[PDB]
Design a binder for this molecule. Structure first.
Ligand code: NA
Lengths: 261, 275
């Protein structure tokens, strides 16, 4: 299948890969304008399992890597810069393994390279939640999103919390066969040994208060990557890029301006 | 032994008995557990240290816990009155008090209305108002109960883990294994009692009222606590004329269980100087 995508600007191409449950649209409130102002061309799209393909099941990481590859080819932008978060970082990482020629450099946020215990606990809890058929009431659900995703600093802030709660109604996350299948697109094995063969410059960004994918797992990906280096953002939850856009964009942009297209 | 004391009359005009424990012969300390917690939660890390320091330790089952787990229709004033009744029954006024969370809130309210019952207090993981996020967590928790919907067991255990512990504990896999096995030995039963304990929280800002409390008080905030953030506790110490604040690094909501030695040392140091 070809997937919905969204092409802006002219210049060195950057492809954004969202996390589980996220659409291309996730990149537009805070990332795309800042990249455009810096002269890049931005591509965002809907991962398989999202939007038009939310009933897609039986797909794997590998299917998702080929989707991304196909997109990079179909637009004739190889090699592109690649920005990915979480599942998206994991898809970026694996694309660079099978198709290094498609990617010039990458930013990977909130990522990991093996099946660590935090990931297992989360895999079990989430899978269980889906198979039970249970519907969390909205306010309890909004509470879990709040604690899962934001820094302590943010939660202490009355105006922000009102926003983030409001903002949840504009970003409904429907439980779908696609969303369940994306649960499986995560490392199953140690991938760090495979990562030691990636040539491309890579920046790994860890968010300090991240509990879904804690920072130290990003240091590990940065260490396995010959040209990798790790950066940490203080006071950012798992949605660090939405919560601290300026600090996050400045870092991706200083990094991307330092490497060749 | 099986000791009982008579609780306050509730707003439905019933009078129940509550269980308590009494150990030692020394200077009396009354421990008040948080929401969901039986008196026995102070036994592993607090009571031995206080007995070895010559304190007598009173623990008890708050209303809505253990034998009264089906109690409903009570309020913060009912629990404050219950605590006072325990104090008056042992004839130990004015007593040292230690409260955590809901129990710290009960101690704060007890000092507002019955200051002569309490000589000094340690308040852990506390607040004297609910902020936006905490207000919302309270409402979310109420909604869950009221809806009937049971959380699957693994989801439940993960949530419990993340809400209660520090990042330091959370990053250490052996430690996480230990606590999740422990969860099975401290199961939190969902009960009309527990649901009712959810409303013994500030509904209004109580910090003004705390301005008249004269007793020496030590407020302890846990740095990684997200169920009651340290800043709310520090607002409480700022309010109290003789309150002082201390923060325990690397402690989640359950700091007094996770960093018992740092907590204990600070409380025993505080109690040796008071008045
Ligand atoms: Na003060």
């Amino acid at each position: 299948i070809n997937l919905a995508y969204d092409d802006n600007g002219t210049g060195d191409p950057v492809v954004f890969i969202a996390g589980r449950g996220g659409a291309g649209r996730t990149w537009h409130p805070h990332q795309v304008p800042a990249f455009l102002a810096a002269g890049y061309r931005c591509i965002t799209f809907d991962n398989r399992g999202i939007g038009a393909t939310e009933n897609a099941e039986g797909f794997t990481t590998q299917t998702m890597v080929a989707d991304t590859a196909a997109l990079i080819e179909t637009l004739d932008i190889a090699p592109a810069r690649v920005v990915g978060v979480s599942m998206g970082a994991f898809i970026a990482q694996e694309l660079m393994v099978v198709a290094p020629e498609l990617v010039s450099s990458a930013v990977l946020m909130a990522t990991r390279g093996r099946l660590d215990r935090a990931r297992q606990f989360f895999n079990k809890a989430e899978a269980e939640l889906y198979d039970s058929g249970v519907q969390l009431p909205p306010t309890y659900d909004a509470r879990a999103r709040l604690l899962e995703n934001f820094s302590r600093k943010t939660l202490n802030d009355d105006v922000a919390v009102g926003d983030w709660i409001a903002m949840f109604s504009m970003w409904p996350i429907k439980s779908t066969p696609g969303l369940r299948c994306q649960l499986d697109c995560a490392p199953q094995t140690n991938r760090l040994p495979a990562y030691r063969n990636i040539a491309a410059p890579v920046l790994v960004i860890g968010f300090a208060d991240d509990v879904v994918t804690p920072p130290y797992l990003g240091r590990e990906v940065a260490d396995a990557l010959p040209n990798g280096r790790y950066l940490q953002i203080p006071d950012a939850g798992h949605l660090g890029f939405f919560e601290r856009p300026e600090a996050v964009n400045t870092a991706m942009l200083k990094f991307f301006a330092s490497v060749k297209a």
